[PDB]
Structures are given as C-alpha cells and as structure tokens.
C-alpha cells in the first residue's frame, strides 16, 4: 500500500535555504523513536532524520522531521539556472545530480 511514487535512500528532492539559495536533500530513512514512521506521527513521535551531502564549503547537516515536504519540493536542479557565483551551490548541484534514486548502484564504490 505505497504511494504513487517510490522512496529511496537517495530521495531526489529540492530544499530551499532562503529565496535564491537551494540545496539537495536525501532521506536516509532513519526514524527518531523505534519505527513509528511505518504508521503515523499521531501515534507517538515518528521523526525521519535526513542528511544531505557535503559541498565545497558547507557541510551536510542532520535534522529530524516528519517529512519537511512543505519546505522541500520533489524535482531536480536546473544547474545552469543555479549557476551564478555560489561555491556551495556548485558542489550541491553535483550531488543532486548523482543522487537519482540509484546512487552507488550502477557505478562501483571506493
């Protein structure tokens, strides 16, 4: 009984940092209780902690939230439309590109 789309570790989505600054977000599928995300936050406190990828100047942070979908969209970056003069945005653009619900699946790891 899943939704229309599928959820993966990579989770290709867009996160808004302000107004003209956005960064890639990936859900590791980590609850903050004991697996309450399989039912509903209404039960206890099902919190899904996600950790993006490290950039060139900014490092990935970890935050626990029900989903934060109201802050992040479901799509991919434009790259060129994001290119301007953001060192951090540059590195973020690369990650978001690599993370496509199939990261570390086709290419061999380190």
How many domains does one find in the chain?
Answer: 1
Which CA distances in Å does 36 have to 2, 29, 51, 100? 16, 12, 19, 26
Length of the chain, in residues: 110
Distance CA 103, CA 98 (A): 6
Which domain, by its residues, includes 8? Answer: 1-110
CATH number for 71: 2.30.30.140
Which CA distances in Å does 89 have to 28, 53, 70? 21, 12, 21
CB 108 within 8 A of CB 35: no
Instruction: Identify the experimental approach.
Output: NMR
Phi/psi at 109 (nearest 5 deg)?
A: -70, -170
CB-CB neighbours of 14 under 10 Å: 17
């Amino acid at each position: 009984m899943l939704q229309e789309r599928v959820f993966h570790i990579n989770d290709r989505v867009w996160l808004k940092t302000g107004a003209n600054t956005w960064w890639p977000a990936k859900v590791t599928s980590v609850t903050g209780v004991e697996g309450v995300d399989g039912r509903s936050s209404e039960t206890g406190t099902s919190t899904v902690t996600v950790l993006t990828y490290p950039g060139t100047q900014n490092k990935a942070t970890y935050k626990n939230v029900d989903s934060h979908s109201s802050a992040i969209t479901f799509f991919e970056p434009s790259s060129e439309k994001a290119v301007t003069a953001n060192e951090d945005l540059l590195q973020a653009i690369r990650n978001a590109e690599e993370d496509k619900e199939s990261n570390a699946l086709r290419f061999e790891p380190t």
